[PDB]
Design a protein around this ligand. Structure first.
Ligand SMILES: [Zn+2]
Length: 185
């Protein structure tokens, strides 16, 4: 099957916000450009605070319809390049969170990383999670565009909110964003 990518703010008004160049986001393209394994700050914005026990899941899928049913995973080379937490096959790793869970779906084999939802920190109206992408789009992905889907869920896995963004992991993010944005125009 294919995970839904439909935007859903839900009851809590959930949506994402974003911040040489290691990571840069294009609102026009709803696309994040980042370097391999570097810190990617993704902000969680809500209108009302979800309950304790709420969880935040990140999962990658292929954007192109002809490859949507495929599981996004690291190429063989990058499975060997680690924190000893993220399974080597996982594309998305969370940095700086002691409670990251790395999961593999029983039936779909899709990977995801989950962390507990935390209310915004002082000096901020949002919660920031630091993600790292462990394989280049050109590797595996082999130049195919991927989407990262972030879902806000309750403790039993029920959907509370969903948002998503395209991602390109590349050596020169700033330059590639510029290229794709200029092309858009
Ligand atoms: Zn790779």
């Amino acid at each position: 099957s294919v995970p839904s990518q439909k935007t859903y703010q839900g009851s809590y008004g959930f949506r994402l916000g974003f911040l040489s160049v290691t990571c840069t986001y294009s609102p026009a393209l709803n696309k994040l450009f980042c370097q391999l394994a570097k810190t990617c700050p993704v902000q969680l914005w809500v209108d009302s605070t979800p309950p304790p026990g709420t969880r935040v899941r990140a999962m990658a899928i292929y954007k192109q319809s002809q490859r949507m049913t495929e599981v996004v995973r690291r190429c063989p080379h990058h499975e060997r390049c680690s924190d000893g937490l993220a399974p080597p096959q996982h594309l998305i790793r969370v940095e700086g969170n002691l409670r990251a869970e790395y999961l593999d779906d029983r039936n779909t084999f899709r990977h995801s990383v989950v962390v507990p939802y935390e209310p915004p920190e002082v000096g901020s109206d949002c919660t920031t999670i630091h993600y790292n992408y462990m394989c280049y789009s050109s590797c595996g992905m082999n130049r195919s565009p991927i989407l990262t889907i972030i879902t806000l869920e309750d403790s039993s896995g029920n959907l509370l909110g969903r948002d998503s963004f395209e991602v390109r992991v590349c050596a020169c993010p700033g330059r590639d964003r510029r290229t794709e944005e200029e092309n858009l125009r």
